[PDB]
Amino acid sequence: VNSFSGYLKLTDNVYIKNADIVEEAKKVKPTVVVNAANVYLKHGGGVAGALNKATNNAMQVESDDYIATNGPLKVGGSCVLSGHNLAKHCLHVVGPNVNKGEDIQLLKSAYENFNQHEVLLAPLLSAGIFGADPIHSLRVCVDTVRTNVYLAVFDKNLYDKLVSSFL
Ligand SMILES: CO[C@@H]1C[C@H](CO)N(c2ncnc3[nH]ccc23)C1
Numbered sequence: 446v447n448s449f450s451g452y453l454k455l456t457d458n459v460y461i462k463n464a465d466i467v468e469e470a471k472k473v474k475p476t477v478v479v480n481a482a483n484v485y486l487k488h489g490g491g492v493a494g495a496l497n498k499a500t501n502n503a504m505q506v507e508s509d510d511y512i513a514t515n516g517p518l519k520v521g522g523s524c525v526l527s528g529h530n531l532a533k534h535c536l537h538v539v540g541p542n543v544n545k546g547e548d549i550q551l552l553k554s555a556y557e558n559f560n561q562h563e564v565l566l567a568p569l570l571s572a573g574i575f576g577a578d579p580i581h582s583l584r585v586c587v588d589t590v591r592t593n594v595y596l597a598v599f600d601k602n603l604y605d606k607l608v609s610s611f612l
Contacts, residue, residue: 447564448473449595455611458593459586463604466492466568466597467499470531475595478528479559479567480504481575482537484517491575492568492599500529508537520547521554536562543576552582556589564593572603579603580610 449469452460462469470478481492486508488497497504507526518524523538540555541547555570570586571577586594598604 447593449566452595453608455583456587458591459596460594461583461596461598461604461607463599463601464597465495465599466566467495467531469566469595469597470496470528471499473566474532475528475564475566476533477536477562477565478532478534479565480535480537481568481570481572482518482523482539483542484520484522484539486512486518486537491573496531496535499531503527503529504535521551523555523558532566536565536567538570540571540575540582541577542571542574544574549577552577552585553589556586559590559594560592562592564595566595566597569596569598569607572598573600579607583607583611 452462454460480496488494488505518539520539520541526535528535538555538558541549541551552571569582571582572579
């Protein structure tokens with residue numbers, strides 16, 4: 446039993462809701478919140494900008510030190526950093542950004558990072574300004590993630606479209 450509330454069950458291990466991931470994290474304080482990161486951990490907009498702004502820029506400060514030490518992530522890769530006031534940990538995961546010309550095939554690799562954590566509050570990878578088909582991303586999520594994932598989808602029309610089209 447966990448404290449997530451109001452989620453629609455899609456499969457044994459994937460759940461979904463129309464909500465801001467920042468608000469879900471503020472309420473649940475999950476062990477892991479997933480950030481929709483880029484390779485430079487520059488948290489400029491979307492989920493990343495929202496998470497970072499909710500940390501009063503502490504996420505960005507920590508991320509800049511990470512990059513200075515380790516260099517950029519790989520597309521499809523991840524790193525574990527602090528969750529600051531929102532969660533115990535933040536798993537920064539890089540889905541491909543089609544508006545940058547990044548390879549959409551890497552979306553499965555990106556979701557594989559979720560399997561290293563038993564429970565996660567996560568966004569839909571490569572959605573929004575990353576430019577991928579959200580129906581496909583939800584499909585890849587369900588067909589790749591085996592651990593328990595709670596997907597918070599901010600955009601109401603997107604949530605409704607995803608539910609009505611899910612197979
Ligand atoms: C079209 O919106 C993009 C894609 C995705 C699903 O709507 N996004 C979010 N998902 C969950 N929490 C969020 N907080 C702030 C943004 C956000 C932003």
